[PDB]
Amino acid sequence: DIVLTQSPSSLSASLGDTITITCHASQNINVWLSWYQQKPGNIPKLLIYKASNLHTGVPSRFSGSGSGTGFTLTISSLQPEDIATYYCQQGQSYPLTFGGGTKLEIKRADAAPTVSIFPPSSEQLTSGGASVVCFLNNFYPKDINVKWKIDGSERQNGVLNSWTDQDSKDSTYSMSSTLTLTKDEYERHNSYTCEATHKTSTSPIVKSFNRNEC
Amino acid sequence: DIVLTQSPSSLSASLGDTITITCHASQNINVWLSWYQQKPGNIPKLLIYKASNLHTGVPSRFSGSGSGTGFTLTISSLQPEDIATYYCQQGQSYPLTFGGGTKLEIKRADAAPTVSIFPPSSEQLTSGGASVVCFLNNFYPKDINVKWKIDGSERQNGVLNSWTDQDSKDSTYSMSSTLTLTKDEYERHNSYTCEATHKTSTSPIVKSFNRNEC
Amino acid sequence: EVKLQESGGGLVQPGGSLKLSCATSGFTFSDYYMYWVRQTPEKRLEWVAYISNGGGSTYYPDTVKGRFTISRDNAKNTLYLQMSRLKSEDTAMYYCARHGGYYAMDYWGQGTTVTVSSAKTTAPSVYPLAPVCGDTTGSSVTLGCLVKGYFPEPVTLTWNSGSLSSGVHTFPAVLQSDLYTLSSSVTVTSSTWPSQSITCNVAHPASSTKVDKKIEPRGPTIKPCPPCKCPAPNLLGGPSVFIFPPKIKDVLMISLSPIVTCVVVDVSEDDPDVQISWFVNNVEVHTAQTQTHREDYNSTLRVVSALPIQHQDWMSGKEFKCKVNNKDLPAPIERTISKPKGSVRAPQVYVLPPPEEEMTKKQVTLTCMVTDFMPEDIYVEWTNNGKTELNYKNTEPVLDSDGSYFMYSKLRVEKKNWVERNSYSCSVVHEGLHNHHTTKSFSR
Amino acid sequence: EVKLQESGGGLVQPGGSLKLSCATSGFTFSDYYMYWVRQTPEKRLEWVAYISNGGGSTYYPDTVKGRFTISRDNAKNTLYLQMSRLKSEDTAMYYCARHGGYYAMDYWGQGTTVTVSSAKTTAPSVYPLAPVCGDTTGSSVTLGCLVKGYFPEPVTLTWNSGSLSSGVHTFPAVLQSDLYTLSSSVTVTSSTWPSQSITCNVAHPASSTKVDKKIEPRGPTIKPCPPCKCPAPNLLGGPSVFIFPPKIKDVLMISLSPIVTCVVVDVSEDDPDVQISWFVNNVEVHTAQTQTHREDYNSTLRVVSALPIQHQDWMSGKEFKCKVNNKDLPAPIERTISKPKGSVRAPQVYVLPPPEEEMTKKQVTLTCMVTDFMPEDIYVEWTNNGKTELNYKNTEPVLDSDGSYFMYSKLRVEKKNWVERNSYSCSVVHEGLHNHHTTKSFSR
Ligand SMILES: *[C@@H]1O[C@H](CO[C@H]2O[C@@H](C)[C@@H](O)[C@@H](O)[C@@H]2O)[C@@H](O[C@H]2O[C@H](CO)[C@@H](O[C@@H]3O[C@H](CO[C@H]4O[C@H](CO)[C@@H](O)[C@H](O)[C@@H]4O[C@@H]4O[C@H](CO)[C@@H](O[C@@H]5O[C@H](CO)[C@H](O)[C@H](O)[C@H]5O)[C@H](O)[C@H]4NC(C)=O)[C@@H](O)[C@H](O[C@H]4O[C@H](CO)[C@@H](O)[C@H](O)[C@@H]4O[C@@H]4O[C@H](CO)[C@@H](O)[C@H](O)[C@H]4NC(C)=O)[C@@H]3O)[C@H](O)[C@H]2NC(C)=O)[C@H](O)[C@H]1NC(C)=O
Ligand SMILES: *[C@@H]1O[C@H](CO[C@H]2O[C@@H](C)[C@@H](O)[C@@H](O)[C@@H]2O)[C@@H](O[C@H]2O[C@H](CO)[C@@H](O[C@@H]3O[C@H](CO[C@H]4O[C@H](CO)[C@@H](O)[C@H](O)[C@@H]4O[C@@H]4O[C@H](CO)[C@@H](O[C@@H]5O[C@H](CO)[C@H](O)[C@H](O)[C@H]5O)[C@H](O)[C@H]4NC(C)=O)[C@@H](O)[C@H](O[C@H]4O[C@H](CO)[C@@H](O)[C@H](O)[C@@H]4O[C@@H]4O[C@H](CO)[C@@H](O)[C@H](O)[C@H]4NC(C)=O)[C@@H]3O)[C@H](O)[C@H]2NC(C)=O)[C@H](O)[C@H]1NC(C)=O
């Protein structure tokens, strides 16, 4: 097989910027390289074939190039509807292989995550389990680290995290960290804390709740 | 009948001082005159008889003197044990008549009244009435004015306060002021305040309670 | 010591008489002139009367001349004062006072309170004044108790029946429209108030009222639940009721007459006849020939109600109720008995001969063994040629390993009758038996 | 115009098969070469297959070679994929694409998920995440709902049926050991939530589960009204004391160790330290090895005091007293025990063999008869070749006619052991016997 190597794996840049994605191939593929665009959710649409040949629609700002083993795609004046994942694919021989992908991220001013802690639901307790959920909404950059603390300031490891893709409108991210215990084990302690560390603030953003009431 | 006049009708003097209380008659009674000493809440005790002959048990401090028509009881170095009312009875002729008496108070250092409000007892409520009691304990001088205030600062008139005689040991006074309302009229109000004014403090000593709990 | 205890104080309508006694005891009464002096509630003292050792010379002030007469009974040491036309002015504390010699009272008694008023005597009401719910903690946990609405003076208010005397204050009771009110405040020490039971003790003479209100903490409102709609009293301590099942034999046998008894104990002559009510499964069997005897014993009376039952009735686990009622009962007490549902097994009855190593003594021992039966209720007897044999004893039934019951019935007999051959038979009657009765016999 | 609508394929377990159809419209389908491409959940792209203009020439990457079969019917305008002998690896999104040029996919279909798994379908559980009880009021009242434990993807979570879509966030479900978890957070603005409701709407296809959890505000932990058995002017008597004699076996047996027990019931859990004082003959045996210790129970505490005794002490008619005290006791409760003084008769002990009319069943009944003995107190057991036999039951002692007592001990045994002859013996122990121990058996 001829494995393609798209680089980098993800990129962030401001609007209007000109950015270059690249692909490399083990064996020579002459000029048989396509470039696809997959905006989060929607299907991939063909952007460029025969290395430079632009497909219908593709506004001039997209430019393919290269030959032999290295090819590059280049977007000028990043227009919002570019945010997607790009993949190159050789078409010299069988099997047809793609080159991993390169995901696009827009750059924006930093923003402070709105956190919120949620004690298990009485409905869940009745069931026999306890899940404390913490929502670190609307923020940027993606880099953030959260850590749970039971009584006092004791950290835990049995968590389940999940972030979303960069939001269309806000350009921000969101995350939902969930600690899942057993009723009993949840009952042995009193305080629960969701501690968040993030570029925006020096002092860790913390939201805590005491089981002493609810 | 032989009439006896005592002067003064009241006396307040600093512990250690010397008292010269008098007693006068309308006619010549030779030396037939007694001096009894009634401490509050107690039966008279014979102190001196036939002008100056001391009774048994009676301390050398007290000394009667005078004869004819005007006698004089004299307490050398006043002391707490001497807070009492002092009478001078005669016995020349019948009936044996006494004088008005003489109250005695000890001018001691001023003292701050310890106040205390008491909401009606549930036991009383059940009955159909409400008495809010306020205790203005251990204080001096006797001059003090208390006033009740219902909601906000509205004064009332259905008050019943009571006073104690100068206490033996602490030389202080005590008072019990009580407002007595109907269950109904007590309920159609919320805040109750016992306000005390007294030489010891410039700002009125106040203790209040809100029926919103008990 | 010398003592003068006055007595006979109280309240009297205007125009009524009163006789005060002044029991003296500590000297030679007959050697002194006695006096009576009263002191108004306003505190002025007034000389009331004089009487010579003998009692033949009296003197009174104009204010009481005629209405009062002082007298003495040297034979009993007591002085006296009889008042006939009392006025409200005559209200005061009366003190009998011994004469010292020099025209002055050297000794005075405790005094007795006398109030002349048209008003009626009224028992007071005591109220424990616990401090504010907003627990004002500190050190000086002052408390108090209100004594309101009493007539006439005075009352005796004490804490801990007398012990607690420090920091206490009692206020000169005052009156508002024919009623007195008095309060006392004990400024007790922090320590832990709810540790030693602090009780407000108040007594009123004229009404013989001794009340002790324990001062309990004003706790936080709204936490538990009020009485769960509990009605008027449905029980008490007095007559007792017990119910009894008929004996296994009476019911299981057609002929015999089953009876259900209900006995009521603990009652006296003040509460005679008592109500009885029988109901089979609540059905109104209105005194169905229920004979009810009344016996006599230790000092009480015991009623015994007997209701003849229908054999099959009991057998069908029907309910038999007994409802007893009487005036002293806050609510009627009714018991209930019935036959418990239970597995049944037929008794394997055997008769064992006296052991060979006993054929020497004059008497021998016949043994009747009953095993594997259910329920436990049974009746076994021994019989000889028809007649119910005497001299047999029955063990109580015991629960064997397999949930069933067993039991023995021993019969002692004179060896002669044994070897000569006689009709000795064990006869058992159990519900789980052919006609409720089997009767295994012997051989030789 | 040109549009590709592949469809079919849901969920299937490993080793299974599935047929993927691709609908083409808008072009002379009969003139193009078609591709089947799959994108795994990781978002990576893989070329599944290619087909010639009129079939015949087909190609499949090594991976799928042998398992897949791409095909077409140039009539219904449909491209197909015949997937067989499935492996986990094949789990991915599948799209059919058209070759509109020189080796390039110009048009793709919508796509169809296919997950191969040996897991069973599980309906989810929804939980309303109301905010913290400590009502963090402000403006941004964010809420949320957890959807836990469901399989497989996906589920549709919508707030208020769709009416609310401004300020919502839905988090990509995560695979926690064969089961999924997803949460969604919504953020409201303006004093509108407590008043106007909000519900979490979640639906799961594979299990046909539509649940709507209304998000109700967090309310405090407290509920009213526990007992209804009428807190009548009732109470508890207080602790009770009982005393027990040593077993006649311990006392008559030198080796054994007799003890006198005193048990105190109804001990308040808040005052477990009761003072148990013992007294042999009115002389204190402070300690004397009194072994006390408590036991918890039905809801109360029971103290058990054991005082070891010397055999003879009991027999010599001594009197053991037990005096218990505690704060709630108005006056100390005492109890005394002593060996009842009376006559003494050795028991006549015989053993009866099972009745002849029972030598059929597999079990037989040995009977031990004990008669004419005083006092009540006795102890009988059965033994076999030395070892204490099991399966024997004893009647309680009964008072015979002549003031003496009798009682039996039944023993059940397997007939085999009986006829083959075995050492079954009735062993009695009673004070009136020489050496306090007799042993009767069957001369067989
Ligand atoms: C004033 O004096 C009296 C009498 O004086 C005696 O004093 C003592 C000190 C001695 O000197 C003695 O010689 C004196 O006679 C005295 O006693 C009375 O008070 C006590 C209570 O303190 C009371 O005790 C109860 O007795 C229940 C049994 O009653 C029968 O048995 C006793 C003896 O045990 C006997 O004395 C009674 O006479 C009575 O006997 C009945 O009599 C009837 C008569 O009609 C017969 O009726 C049958 O019914 C029909 C027709 O009538 C059939 O066809 C038959 O033909 C017919 O015969 C009965 O057969 C006959 N039976 C017997 C056996 O003779 C007893 O049950 C009860 O015990 C229960 O309750 C206590 C709590 O109180 C519990 O601790 C017990 O454990 C038990 O509890 C029950 O348990 C069962 C299961 O086992 C449960 O199912 C129940 O739910 C459960 N609860 C209850 C509530 O039952 C208790 O022991 C005596 O009976 C009284 N005796 C008399 C004569 O009045 C007083 O104390 C004294 N008072 C004072 C202040 O000084
Ligand atoms: C919380 O629950 C408890 C218990 O829970 C049970 O409750 C019952 C109701 C059921 O629901 C059951 O399912 C639950 O599990 C409850 O009960 C307690 O209180 C009651 C009274 O309220 C009390 O009753 C007394 O019981 C006496 C009998 O006690 C013995 O036997 C019973 C079983 O029959 C057993 O449970 C006891 O534990 C005890 O057993 C003794 O234990 C001793 C050691 O303690 C052994 O001794 C051995 O001997 C030597 C050395 O001593 C060996 O070497 C060993 O080393 C040594 O251990 C004994 O062998 C063992 N016996 C047996 C047979 O195994 C009962 O006698 C007593 O009756 C008196 O009162 C009634 C009237 O009320 C009278 O009619 C009686 O006559 C008697 O009164 C006395 O009578 C004699 C003559 O008979 C007179 O001479 C006396 O003067 C006279 N008065 C006195 C003061 O003596 C009574 O019935 C329960 O036993 C308690 N439960 C327990 C487990 O102890 C609680 O009340 C409940 N809480 C509340 C608030 O309700």
Residue D134, SS3 per DSSP: coil
Residue C380 near residue C427, CB atoms below 8 Å: yes
Which residues on neighbouring strands pair with residue D144, listed in sequence order? D129, D185
User: In which residue are the tokens 């490399």 written?
Assistant: A24
β-bridge mates for residue D143, sequence order: D186
Evaluate: CB of D67 within 6 angstroms of ligand 2.
no
Please work out whether the CB of residue D59 comes within 6 Å of at least one atom of ligand 2. Answer: no
Q: How far apart are alpha carbons D386 and C138 in whole angstroms?
A: 77
Q: Are C and A neighbours with ≥3 CB pairs closer than 8 A?
A: no
Residue A162 and residue A134 in contact, taking contact as beta carbons nearer than 8 Å: no
Name the nearest CA neighbour of C394 among B213, A185, D396: D396
> How many other C-beta atoms can be found within 10 angstroms of the C-beta atom of residue D261?
17
Residue in B130, B139, B132, B131 with CA at minimum distance from that of residue B175? B139
Write out residues 63-102 of A within 8 Å (CB-CB) of D. 85, 87, 89, 91-92, 94-98, 100-101
Residue D248: in which H helix or E strand, if any? helix D248-252
Q: Does C254 touch chain D (CB under 8 A)?
A: no
- In Å, what is the CA distance from D42 to each residue of A97, D38, D39, D91, D105? 16, 11, 8, 10, 21
Neighboring chains of A (3 or more beta-carbon pairs < 8 A): D
What is the Cα–Cα distance from D53 to B162, expressed in whole angstroms? 118
| Run of H or E including D418 | helix D415-419
SS3 D89: helix
What are the b/e assignments for C254-275, b being 16+ CB within 10 Å? eeeebbbebbbeebeeeeeebe
| Residue nearest atom 72 of ligand 2, based on CA coordinates | D242
Is ligand 1 within 6 A of the CB of residue C247?
yes
Go through the domains of chain B in sequence order and give each one's CATH number.
Answer: 1-108 (2.60.40.10), 109-211 (2.60.40.10)
Q: How many residues does chain C have?
A: 444
Give which of B83, B82, B65 is closest to B74, Cα–Cα. Answer: B65
CB-side neighbour CA atoms (13 Å) of C352: 26
Whether residue A117 contacts residue A133, with contact meaning beta carbons closer than 8 Å, is answered with yes
Question: What's the one-letter identity of residue D268?
Answer: S
For chain B, where are the E strands, in sequence order? 4-7, 10-13, 19-25, 33-38, 46-49, 53-54, 62-65, 71-75, 85-90, 103-106, 117-118, 129-139, 145-149, 159-163, 173-182, 191-198, 201-210
Distance from Cα C242 to the centre of ligand 1, integer Å: 8
Name every chain B residue with its beta carbon within 8 A of the beta carbon of C132: 117-119, 209, 214
Which residues in chain C have Cβ-Cβ distances shorter than 8 Å to D400? Answer: 393, 410, 412
Are A86 and A104 a contacting pair, CB within 8 Å?
A: yes
DSSP class of residue C29 equals G
Q: Give the ligand whose atoms come closest to the C-alpha of residue D257.
A: 2
The verdict on a CB contact (< 8 Å) between D142 and A92 is: no
Question: Residues of B with CB below 8 A from C186's CB?
Answer: none
Q: Are D37 and D22 in contact (CB under 8 A)?
A: no
Q: What are phi and psi of B82, to 5 degrees?
A: -105, 10
CA distance C439 to A45: 105
Q: Is the dihedral of CA C160, C162, C167, C172 positive or negative?
A: positive
Output the CA–CA distances (angstroms, integers) from residue D290 to C179, C257, D280, D287, in the order listed. Answer: 64, 56, 12, 5
Residues with Cβ < 8 Å from D309, sequence gap 6 or more?
D246, D258, D259, D260, D280, D320
- Give the pair of three-digit tokens for residue C194: 């709810």
Question: What is the resolution of the experimental data for this entry, in Å?
Answer: 2.8
Give the closest-approach CA distance of C106 to chain B in angstroms. 5
Shortest distance, CA D212 to any CA of chain C (angstroms): 34
Give the C-alpha separation, D69 to D79, whole Å. 11
Q: Which helix (H) or strand (E) holds D119?
A: none
User: In angstroms, rounded to a whole number, what is the distance separating the alpha carbons of residues D208 and C111?
Assistant: 97
Q: What is the amino acid identity at position A183?
A: K
Q: Helices (DSSP H) in C268-354: which residue ranges?
A: 311-315
Dihedral (C-alpha) D333, D337, D340, D345: value to the nearest 10 degrees? 140
- C398–D393 C-beta distance less than 8 A: yes
Contacts by C48-52, CB closer than 8 A, 24 or more apart: C48/C81, C48/C94, C49/C81, C50/B94, C51/C79
Return the percent helix, strand and coil in chain C, to nearest 5.
Answer: 5, 45, 50
Q: How many other CB atoms sit within 10 Å of the CB of residue C34?
A: 26
Beta-bridged to residue C301, according to DSSP, are C267, C296
Contact yes or no for C355 and D358 at CB 8 A = no
Q: Which of A88, A189, A180, A72 is nearest to A134 (CA)?
A: A180
Of C411, C358, C407, C354, which Cα lies nearest the Cα of D355?
C354
CA of C304 to the centre of ligand 1 (A): 12
Which whole-number Å values give the CA distances from B88 to A206, B17, B52, B70, B96, in the listed order?
85, 21, 12, 11, 11
**Of the candidates D227, D355, D400, which has its C-beta nearest C352's C-beta?**
D355
- How many angstroms separate the alpha carbon of residue C377 from the centre of ligand 1? 19
**Nearest beta carbon to residue D142 from set A85, A114, A121:** A114
- D404–C contact, CB cutoff 8 A: no
Q: Report whether C92 contacts C114 (CB < 8 A).
A: yes
Q: Which atom of ligand 1 is nearest to C243's Cα?
A: 94
Evaluate whether A12 touches A35 at the Cβ level (below 8 Å): no
Q: Residue D172 gets which letter from DSSP?
A: P
For ligand 2, atom 29, the nearest C-alpha belongs to D242
Question: CB neighbours (10 Å) of residue B128?
Answer: 9
Judged by CB atoms closer than 8 Å, whether chains meet at D50 and A94 is answered as yes
Which residues does chain C have within 8 Å of residue B128's beta carbon, measured at their own beta carbons? none
Token code pair at residue C18: 């009163």
Residues making up chain A, counted from first to last: 214
User: Is ligand 1 within 6 A of the CB of residue C297?
Assistant: yes
For C82, the 3-state DSSP assignment is strand
Is the Cβ of D385 closer than 8 Å to some Cβ of chain C? no
> Alpha helices, DSSP H only, in C104-144?
none
> Which one of D95, D100, D146 has the shortest CB-CB distance to A133?
D146
Chain breaks in chain D (C to N over 2.5 A) after: none
How far is Cα B187 from Cα B181, in angstroms, rounded to an integer? Answer: 9
| Closest residue in chain B to residue C45, using alpha carbons only | B98
Residue positions counted in chain D: 444
Q: Which candidate in C235, C357, C396, C408 is best for mutational testing of the D interface (most D CBs within 10 A)?
A: C408
Angstrom distance (rounded) from CA C4 to CA C32: 13
Contacts of C242 (CB under 8 A, 6+ apart): C262, C263, C264, C265, C335
C413 by DSSP, 3-state: which?
strand
DSSP C374-398: BSS--EEEEEETTEE-SSEEEPPPE
Between the CA of C243 and the centroid of ligand 1 the distance, in Å, is 10
Do B97 and B124 contact (CB within 8 A), yes or no? no
d(CA D266, CA D276): 15
List the 134-193 stretch of A: residues with Cβ below 8 A of D: 135, 137, 160, 162-164, 174-176, 178
> Which technique?
X-ray
Radius of gyration of chain A (CA): 23
Which residues of chain C make contact with B137, given a CB cutoff of 8 A? 142, 169, 185, 187
Strand C180-189 to strand C174-175: parallel, antiparallel, or no bridges (unpaired)? antiparallel
CA distances from B53 to B30, B35, B75, B85, C99 (A): 14, 10, 15, 20, 16
Instruction: Check: CB of residue C11 under 8 Å from CB of residue C152.
Output: yes
Q: Are C115 and C67 in contact (CB under 8 A)?
A: no
Interatomic CA distance for residues C101 and C96, integer angstroms? 15
d(CA A37, CA A101): 10
Report the C-alpha gap between B80 and B15 in whole angstroms: 8
DSSP D17: -
Single-letter amino acid, residue D303: V
Q: Could you give the CA distance from residue B165 to residue B42 in angstroms, rounded to a whole number?
A: 12
In 3D space, the residue among D433, D335, D424 whose CA is nearest the CA of residue D375 turns out to be D433
Which of C225, C235, C393 comes nearest D232 by C-beta?
C235
* Residue D40: closest CA among D108, D4, D93, D3: D93
User: Rounded to the nearest 5°, which phi and psi values hold at C353?
Assistant: -80, 155
- Reported residue count of chain B is 214
DSSP C119: S
Q: Which of C50, C148, C174 sits opposite B94 (nearest CB)?
A: C50
Task: Tell me which residue of D53, D52, D48 sits closest to D65, measured CA to CA.
Answer: D48
SS (H, E, C) B159-194: EEEEECCCCCCCCCEEEEEEEEEEHHHHHCCCEEEE
CA distance B137 to chain C (A): 8
- Does ligand 2 come within 6 angstroms of the Cβ of D256? no
Question: How far does residue C434's CA lie from ligand 1's centre (Å)?
Answer: 34
- Across the interface, whether the CB atoms of C181 and B209 are under 8 A apart is answered no
Contact D145, D127 (CB under 8 A): yes
- Report the amino acid identity of residue A192: Y
Contact between D265 and D258 under an 8 Å Cβ cutoff? The reply is no
- Residues 6 or more apart whose CB falls under 8 angstroms from that of D157 comprise D145, D147, D170, D182, D184, D200, D201, D202
Subunit partners of chain D (3 or more CB pairs within 8 A) = A, C
Give me the residue from B49, B118, B133 closest to C102, CB to CB.
B49
Select from D216, D218, D126, D211 the least CA-distant residue to D161. D211
DSSP C230-282: --S----SS-EEEEEPPPHHHHHSSSS--EEEEEEEEE-TTS-S-EEEEEETT
Whose tokens are 């609508």? That residue is: D5
Taking the alpha carbons of C161, C163, C169, C172 in that order, is the dihedral positive or negative?
Answer: positive
According to DSSP, the residues that pair with C224 across neighbouring strands are none
Residue A117 neighbours by CB distance under 10 Å: 22
Question: Is D247 close to ligand 2, i.e. is its CB under 6 Å away?
Answer: yes
Phi (first) and psi of residue A176, to 5 degrees: -130, 110
Q: Is D273 helix (H, G, I), strand (E, B) or coil?
A: coil
Distance (Å, whole) CA C155 – CA C386 = 85
Residue B64 vs residues B8, B31, B86, C224, C310: alpha-carbon distances, Å: 17, 11, 12, 70, 104
Nearest by CB: A131 against D45, D148, D171: D148
Task: Inspect the interface and report whether the beta carbons of C221 and B101 lie closer than 8 Å.
Answer: no
Ligand 2 center from residue A126 Cα (angstroms):
42
Question: For residue B137, what are its two tokens?
Answer: 């304990």
Yes or no: say if D302 and D264 are a contact pair by the CB < 8 Å rule: yes
CB B66 within 8 A of CB B51: yes
Written in H, E and C, the secondary structure of chain A is CCCECCECCEEEECCCCCEEEEEEECCCCCCCEEEEEECCCCCCEEEEECCCEECCCCCCCEEEEEECCEEEEEECCCCHHHCCEEEEEECCCCCCCECCCEEEEECCCCECCECCEECCCHHHHHHCEEEEEEEEEEEECCCCEEEEECCCCCECCCEECCECCCCCCCCCEEEEEEEEEEHHHHHCCCEEEEEEEECCEEEEEEEEEECCCC
**Domains of chain D and any CATH numbers:** 1-119 (2.60.40.10), 120-224 (2.60.40.10), 238-341 (2.60.40.10), 342-444 (2.60.40.10)
